[PDB]
Subunit: 188 residues, 2 copies
């Protein structure tokens, strides 16, 4: 096999923990991860002011597809920026069409709603984002810490980030690798 | 009470999750956090290549003390850099003298050993850093996910970062605030 590839879309206001945990854990899994800045290549100021420098602009990373998984971190403001981006809409639709994995956490899943992605899927979100996600009843809600309905994988919050990340790893590289990567993390 | 202040020392090779989780959670707790770059004010390349821009250089942040807590993230190479820094040695000694809290996670506590900080304390580390930390028997080892012996607070790894951060919050702002901050994180 070749190394699986992941696209993590980073926007201003993104929840930094929900961005870094998946990127870190996936790289620990041997996955080639690209942190793409929605607004460009400049540093991104996250929800709790942690400043992260993306690997490239989404505009450029978008031209290096396809990715085995597109990851949408949470954070209310970050998710809203994702929801309003035409570039994100296109990337997600193409990924869905390719039958590729789409993973979103916390408020991140509300971007799927905005772009009419995976309607009919069972999904979860941060408790405070449920109403927004369920507007129209286009999805069926779940309270599972991590929910995976086919190629739509969602999670609830910062505290579920490791489970979310390991779920992505399992989907891309298998249960054995996920387990190997998990042990050194010292998770409960 | 004025807001408590935290100094997080960020060095190349630092474990990004162990840096961001404590910074994020502490800021959620109303703590004024300063991410200080060991080598200066330039972006720092972490262990899994996540690039973080510090709020200021350690040189400058050092002059804005004192801090209610000095935080040492893990990551073998990051910890090594902290252990070799004369600036870190002075900061830690002052903090210990001031009877101020010192928190280190994963391999981070081996920097306490390097600077002869808190000898005699019960501590924990990432399992793989135990031998290094115990060289000379200057500390008593613990397998608790979070260990707090007086003003020396330690933790084991990425998966214990939330517990580690919430323990810092509890020590500085109390149990009520720690509980309030914890709820929205959706922790197990």
């Amino acid at each position: 096999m070749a190394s699986k590839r992941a696209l993590v879309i980073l926007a201003k206001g993104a929840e930094e923990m929900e961005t870094v945990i998946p990127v870190d854990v996936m790289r620990r899994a041997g996955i080639k991860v690209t942190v793409a800045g929605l607004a460009g290549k400049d540093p991104v100021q996250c929800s709790r002011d942690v400043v992260i420098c993306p690997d490239a602009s989404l505009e450029d990373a978008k031209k290096e597809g396809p990715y085995d998984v597109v990851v949408l971190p949470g954070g209310n403001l970050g998710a809203q920026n994702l929801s309003e981006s035409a570039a994100v809409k296109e990337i997600l639709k193409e990924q869905e069409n390719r039958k590729g994995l789409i993973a979103a956490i916390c408020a991140g899943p509300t971007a799927l709603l905005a772009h009419e992605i995976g309607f009919g899927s069972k999904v979860t979100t941060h408790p405070l984002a449920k109403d927004k996600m369920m507007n129209g009843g286009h999805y069926t809600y779940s309270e599972n810490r991590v929910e995976k309905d086919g190629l739509i994988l969602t999670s609830r919050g910062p505290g579920t980030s490791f489970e979310f990340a390991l779920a992505i790893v399992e989907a891309l590289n298998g249960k054995e690798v996920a387990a190997q990567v998990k042990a050194p993390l010292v998770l409960k």
